[model samples]
Target: VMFEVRQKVYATLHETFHAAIIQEVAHDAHTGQLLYYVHYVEQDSRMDRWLPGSALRERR
Candidate 1:
């Protein structure tokens, strides 16, 4: 949650795979609800995780 340069993050798709990234706009349905990001990356995959939109807060 420190930075975001690469998209298509890793998400356990099958046998473990990568999911979309910085997709705060795509997965913006549960903004008000609290849910844990559950995903298992394969033995070989980039760092996998998820964060809420607040993580995208910008100082204007």
Candidate 2:
């Protein structure tokens, strides 16, 4: 929930890891889970994805 726009982060995608930046964030509403909308480095908007907080880290 502390994650904000433009925040740099590391995300695990499809069992692999990649550097990314947070574009937006939201809560799951019912479960209150943190969700991050991120854009993977060197990739286009098509690569942007929503990831669970559990799958993200501020540090690699």
Candidate 3:
């Protein structure tokens, strides 16, 4: 299962790495693994969902 927070990019990044390696090491050591994955996603207006108002703002 892929859990994601819709607006917060970093939350997605953190969760992705957490899911990938949380089983490989102790909980305390996970923070050190931060740099192992460089999280990124594209920023494109064409991909934004068509919504009417404030809820429709663009995101990366």
Find the candidate with the highest TM-score and give its number: 2
The lDDT values for all models are: 0.37, 0.84, 0.24
Clashes of each: 2, 0, 0
Better of 1 and 3 by TM-score: 1
Model 1 regions more than 4 Å off:
1-8, 25-60
TM-scores of the candidates are 0.22, 0.83, 0.16
Candidate 2, lDDT over the whole model: 0.84
Instruction: List the pairs of residues colliding in candidate 3.
Output: none
lDDT by residue (tens digit), candidate 2, 27-48: 8899988888999986888989
Best by lDDT: 2
Tens-place lDDT digits, model 3, residues 1-60: 121233322213322311121111112255432221212334233332222121222233
lDDT of 1 by residue, 1-60 (tens): 332444334443444343444423233365554322423323332543455433332221
Which residue pairs of candidate 2 clash? none
The TM-score measured for candidate 1 stands at: 0.22
Rank list by TM-score: 2, 1, 3
- By lDDT rank, best first, the candidates go 2, 1, 3
Q: In model 2, which regions exceed 4 Å deviation?
A: none
